[PDB]
Amino acid sequence: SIQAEEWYFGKITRRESERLLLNAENPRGTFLVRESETTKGAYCLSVSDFDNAKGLNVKHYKIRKLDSGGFYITSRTQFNSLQQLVAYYSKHADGLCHRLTTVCPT
């Protein structure tokens, strides 16, 4: 169950995710998964990033879950669970701003 995952923050808003992620102590890739504010059954992967152009900033990625079972950000790259998706993106940056590193502090 994802509700049991420590990186699953459930029902928190995009602004709240940004307040949490915009902590100067967070290295690139700090993250959390939350419910989408707009899409029933969809999730959002909120990730911290940092560069010399934007400084500390946050990106939000939509994660889809098909009735058919798969979870994905891009339909070309799917997973059997949200957990496997997180594990994969903790090792490959692919199209994300940074690979996922550690769970966001409260």
Q: List interacting residues with ligand 853 (CB under 6 A).
A: 14, 36-39, 44, 59-62, 73-74, 94-96
To ligand 853, the closest distance from the beta carbon of 77 in angstroms equals 6
Report which residue's Cβ sits closest to ligand 853.
Answer: 95
Number of alpha carbons in the 13 Å side-chain half-sphere of residue 82: 22
To ligand 853, the closest distance from the beta carbon of 68 in angstroms equals 20
Q: 79: closest CA among 91, 92, 65, 67? A: 65
Q: In this complex, which beta carbon is closest to ligand 853, that of residue 74 or of residue 80? A: 74
To ligand 853, the closest distance from the beta carbon of 101 in angstroms equals 15
| Residue 38 CB contacts under 8 Å (≥ 6 apart), including other chains | none
Two tokens, residue 92 = 């490959």
